[PDB]
Each structure stands twice: as C-alpha cells, then as structure tokens.
C-alpha cells in the first residue's frame, strides 16, 4: 500500500513565451513527499510545496489532492526536455514526461547561399540552414513552378534537403530558387536564391535568304541567346553597320534572349549582298549569314 502514480506524466507541448503546465498524479500519498526535477541537468525543482530552484518562472500548486502541478511561466526553448516526478518511497518511485517547446522556423543568413553564378555545364550547390522546433524540413522550389534537376538524374518541382546539388547546370535551370522552411509551427518562412548561368552566344536565323525590289522597305531579323547579355551588331563586307538614316538596327532584349532586326529603307542596288548578324559577350561570339538578293 505504497503511493502509486495515478497515470502517466502527461506529455505537454507549448509555444515559446507561454506558460508550461506539467501535472503529476499520485494516489495514496500518505506522509510521503512529491518532488519535481529537470532530468537532463539533474536539477531539483520542487519538494512538496517548496520550490528549491531560484528560477522565478517555476511554481508548484496542489489544489486537487491527487494532482501536483508544476508551472513554468514564460517558457524558453531551453526548458524543452524531460521532467521527472519522484516519490520518496523506499525504493524510490519516479516517472518522466517530456515538455516540448515549439518555435516557428527561421532561416539563417549563413550558410544559406547567396546569389550563384555558374558556367553552363558545371556543378553548383545551393545551401540553406534553418532553425526551429521541431527542426524544420527544408523544401526547394522555383518561381513559376519550373522543374529542379534532381541528383538522381530525374527532375521534379520540389526537393527536400538543406543542400541542393545540381551537376551540369543548364540555362533553363537559371532563375530564382526558393528555400522554404516549415515545421508545422506557423509562420513558414522562405528565402530566395538566384541561380545565374553564363554561357557563350548562339544565333538562330528564320530566313537566311531574303529578297526585295528597289524603293522597298525590308527587315532582316536574327535571334540570339547569351548570358551575360551580348552586344549584337550587323556586318557587311566585313564592315560594321551604323544607323545611317537608311539602315536602322534594333534589339529587343528579354532575359538571356535577344531579337535583333535591321530595317533597310528604300532598297538600292548597292544594298544587295551578304549580311551578318553578330552576338558577342564575355564567353565568346557567334554569327550567322543572311543573303539579300534582287527580284
């Protein structure tokens, strides 16, 4: 007929800065004495109604005869851990329960990756570190939902992991990636990471053969892809072409794409010949020929 525990030491979950309330139930306590304490540090908390700890945030109440209640006001994440309830029987009895302190997640600036600049076809690793309770799972996405090249040769719209490694980066992989940290404790937070892919230029021409008649206005057009952005100009007889009141070159730039036109006004017999659109950037140059002929 020694004291017995009326039930388990109930697990308790509580968000940071609130009041934790652990409760220990003892039947037939008689003249015996109940004691609380923190397990990890082996810190005596309370004995009967006295608080042994000088931690002003802890209190003990014994309203109902069978329930001894430990109260931790303004909980910190450092209070998370195992707590014990002890009865000074012989041999002594003890049961333990866990106090889980949940914290909304946060993404650390370090070692989380800053903007990345990678040559096309080379490796890159995006890192991201977050802190929370429970520990947050990290999810990678791209703006617009683009696919992420996965380590296993496949691709998907999301990847779990603190570090995302991409082998052989492609210009299509370029854009804004998102490090999304979540742990069930709102609010979920995220951080944007730019992946920049540099590559030399390439040119496509819809019509490498165009004709016209005198006094006519015709327009030649090329398309290029190059990053960083390329300088695009036109050539003829190996000579640059300047806006000359008759020729007007344009460029329509969008990301790593460029559409370059050369509008010629009032065609003259001297204009016919071999033109060239050219694109050049840090990583190389390229060109493409267009022939303009007479009707």
């Amino acid at each position: 007929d020694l004291p017995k525990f009326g039930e388990l030491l109930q697990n308790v979950t509580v968000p940071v800065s609130r009041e934790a309330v652990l409760q220990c139930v003892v039947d037939n306590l008689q003249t015996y004495k109940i004691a609380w304490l923190r397990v990890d540090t082996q810190t005596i908390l309370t004995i009967q109604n006295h608080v042994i700890t000088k931690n002003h945030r802890m209190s003990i109440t014994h309203a109902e005869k069978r329930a001894w209640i430990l109260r931790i006001r303004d909980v910190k994440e450092s209070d998370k851990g195992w707590y014990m309830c002890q009865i000074n029987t012989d041999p002594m009895k003890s049961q333990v329960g866990y106090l889980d302190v949940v914290v909304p997640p946060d993404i650390l600036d370090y070692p989380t990756s800053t903007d990345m600049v990678i040559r096309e076809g080379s490796n890159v690793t995006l890192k991201c570190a977050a802190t929370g309770s429970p520990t947050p799972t990290i999810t990678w996405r791209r703006e617009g939902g683009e696919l992420i090249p996965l380590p296993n040769g496949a691709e998907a719209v999301a990847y779990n992991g603190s570090f995302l490694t991409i082998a052989k980066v492609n210009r299509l992989n370029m854009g804004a990636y998102l490090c999304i940290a979540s742990n069930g404790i709102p609010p979920t937070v995220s951080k944007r990471v730019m992946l920049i892919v540099h590559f030399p230029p390439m040119i496509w021409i819809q019509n490498q053969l165009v004709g016209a008649a005198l006094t006519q206005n015709i327009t030649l057009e090329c398309q290029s892809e190059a990053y960083p952005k390329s300088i695009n100009y036109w050539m003829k007889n190996d000579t640059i072409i300047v806006p000359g009141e008759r020729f007007v070159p344009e460029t329509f730039e969008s990301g790593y794409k460029i559409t370059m036109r050369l509008t010629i006004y009032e065609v003259d017999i001297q204009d016919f010949g071999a033109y060239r659109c050219v694109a050049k950037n840090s990583l190389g140059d390229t060109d493409g020929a267009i022939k303009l002929y007479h009707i």
Binding site: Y32, K33, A35, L37, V39, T41, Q42, T43, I44, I47, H50, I52, T53, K54, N55, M84, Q86, N88, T89, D90, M92, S94
Partner: protein
C-alpha cells in the same frame, strides 16, 4: 556580490569500509540564501534538500556546520550497493554542482579485538594481572597478520617500537607475548601490581579495531 563557489580541493574519492559510516564533505563559500542538495546521480534520487532529508532510507542524513559552509552526507552502515557518484548541488540558476564518488570496499572483513574478562578490573597492590587479547575475524586470515601493541593511556608499552619516546614505562614488571595459535593473540602480564600501574590498558592491533580494559590497583 560574490556568487557561491565550491572548494574544489575537498577530497572527491571517499572510500569507506563496509559497515562504517561514510562521509562526503562538500564546502561552499558565499552560500548566502542558497541551499545545498545531495542527489544520487545514478537514478536522480534526491537525498537531502537543505537540512530537510527527502530520501526515506534511514541510513542517509546530511549535517551542516553552524556557519553553513560545510555540508556533509553521512551513510550509516555503508554497503557496496551504495558505491557510486553523489552530487553536491547549490540551487542557483543555472545550478552549480560538484560530483563525489563513494567507493565502499569490503576487504578485509571486519576485525575486532576482544579482551577476555570484565571491562573494569580491581587488583590489590602486589597481586598480578594478566590480560588476554584476541582478534575476532572470519576464517580467512592468510598473510594479513600484523603486530599487536599495548598501551596504558596514551603511552605505548611495547618496547623498541616508539623511538624516541621520553614517556616510556618501566618494563621490569610488565611483559607481553604475542602468539599466533590459529587465532591471533597477545597477552599482557603485570607482575607485582603497583598503584602507578592503574590506568586504561588498550590492546592495539594493526589489523583489527582496538579494545580496552581499565585496570585499577588498590591498597590492602
């Protein structure tokens, strides 16, 4: 203000012979209004919180000096199962603590000297006195046999042992004989008792607890 601090020079490896009272002394300077707790690290069993005793094992008690500097954990009739680490704990925040190790050894077994006869003798002047002392110990003696000495009060009587002793007693009437006939034994004889022979005779072994007889020499 000075925060409480431990005297890390106190012995941290207490060794007690089984059956004896073990004592783990813990000294804290600048205690202030903080308390000291004794806890058993093995299972977190709280032993004492301040002067209050929490444990219900009757052999455990804490004692503090008047100035509350020295806190001592006493384990009556210590047994091997009591060996382990005990934590001296001050209720600061965070809490500080020192760890002492209690080692309760069991070898050799309890040995106790015994002097056959009444404890207080009374003999007339000129009579003779013989005191027979023997060591009560378990069967196993083996090579754990040591000399047995005698004392009148604080003065040793065995000759050629305490050198120099300017308080040596004249051994012309006092003889001693130590024989090991199965049981370790020593016999003290006082020939022609004299008033100055009166005193507290002690059988002092080196392998067993001592025993004593009070010898009174009287007139007539």
């Amino acid at each position: 203000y000075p925060p409480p601090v431990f005297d890390f020079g106190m012995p941290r490896n207490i060794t007690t012979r089984t059956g004896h009272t073990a004592a783990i002394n813990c000294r804290v300077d600048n205690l202030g209004d903080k308390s000291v707790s004794w806890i058993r690290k093995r299972d977190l069993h709280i032993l004492t919180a301040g002067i209050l005793t929490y444990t219900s094992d009757e052999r455990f008690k804490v004692v503090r000096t008047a100035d509350s500097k020295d806190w001592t954990l006493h384990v009556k009739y210590a047994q091997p199962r009591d060996s382990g680490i005990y934590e001296c704990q001050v209720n600061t925040e965070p809490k500080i603590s020192m760890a002492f190790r209690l080692n309760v050894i069991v070898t050799p077994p309890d040995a106790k000297a015994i002097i056959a006869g009444p404890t207080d003798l009374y003999v007339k002047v000129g009579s003779s006195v013989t005191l027979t002392c023997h060591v009560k110990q378990p069967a196993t003696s083996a090579q754990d046999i040591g000399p047995i000495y005698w004392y009148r009060g604080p003065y040793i009587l065995t000759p050629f042992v305490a050198h120099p002793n300017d308080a040596a007693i004249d051994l012309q009437r006092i003889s001693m004989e130590s024989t090991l006939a199965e049981k370790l034994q020593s016999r003290l004889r006082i020939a022609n008792a004299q008033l100055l022979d009166t005193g507290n005779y002690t059988c002092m072994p080196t392998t067993a607890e001592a025993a004593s007889v009070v010898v009174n020499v009287i007139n007539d």
